[PDB]
DNA sequence: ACCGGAAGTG
DNA sequence: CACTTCCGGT
DNA sequence: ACCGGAAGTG
DNA sequence: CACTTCCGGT
């Protein structure tokens, strides 16, 4: 299906397998990206698009701000915090 | 039907005008039930369950705890805090 | 009010 | 399993 | 590395 | 419609 990055990033969190790359860390939603690299292959991969990288997923997430799907850990680098409120309105059709 | 109660409560989470019943209040997944009872009457109504209160509704949310999929605000009584480890891995298949 | 054990449901 | 039902704890 | 405006995609 | 692509700011 048309599986969404929020959707995706939490699905890789789910699993400990994936600690090299992306882990929870600090206070309920905040999670950091141990290689951004490898975060945007596998999202590219999934997506059918190669031409995938941090910089183009990073202002994918910045769009999540506006909608209070998440938001960045300030300070902390590839660090964000996913955001309740607009999840749970995500959530929904 | 075929819901799980951590959904439902998001569902009336993200529309507002549920805010008589249940509402966000405080950091990153805390909420808190205006309307303790009113909430465990439309749980019993989406589940066909006629018998359901409080007491029962609470039970379901203890077992919560274990699974980390949330935890209690505590002092703040009708408090609860959705955990997003939980959350995280009981969204996938 | 909130807690968790115990037994039961499809 | 994911609750529902019930009750003796604090 | 992180920010948001802008134009384009399936 | 949720990104993808590109880039001139800080
Ligand atoms: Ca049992
Ligand atoms: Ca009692
Ligand atoms: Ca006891
Ligand atoms: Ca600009
Ligand atoms: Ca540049």
Same mark, same amino acid.
């Given at each position: 299906? =048309?599986? =969404?990055?929020? =959707?995706? *990033?939490?699905?890789?969190?789910?699993?400990? +397998? #994936?600690?090299?790359?992306?882990? @929870?860390? !600090?206070? #309920?939603?905040?999670? $950091? /990206?141990?290689?951004?690299?490898?975060?945007?292959?596998? @999202? !590219?991969?999934? $997506?059918? $698009?190669?031409? /995938?990288? %941090?910089?183009?997923?990073?202002?994918? *997430?910045? %769009? &999540? &701000?506006?909608?209070?799907? /998440?938001?960045?850990?300030?300070? $902390?680098? &590839? +660090? %964000?915090?996913?955001?309740?409120? !607009?999840?749970? =309105?995500? *959530?929904?059709?």
């Amino acid at each position: 299906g =048309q599986i =969404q990055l929020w =959707q995706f *990033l939490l699905e890789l969190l789910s699993d400990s +397998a #994936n600690a090299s790359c992306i882990t @929870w860390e !600090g206070t #309920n939603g905040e999670f $950091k /990206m141990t290689d951004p690299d490898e975060v945007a292959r596998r @999202w !590219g991969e999934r $997506k059918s $698009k190669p031409n /995938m990288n %941090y910089d183009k997923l990073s202002r994918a *997430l910045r %769009y &999540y &701000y506006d909608k209070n799907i /998440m938001t960045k850990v300030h300070g $902390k680098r &590839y +660090a %964000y915090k996913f955001d309740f409120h !607009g999840i749970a =309105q995500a *959530l929904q059709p």
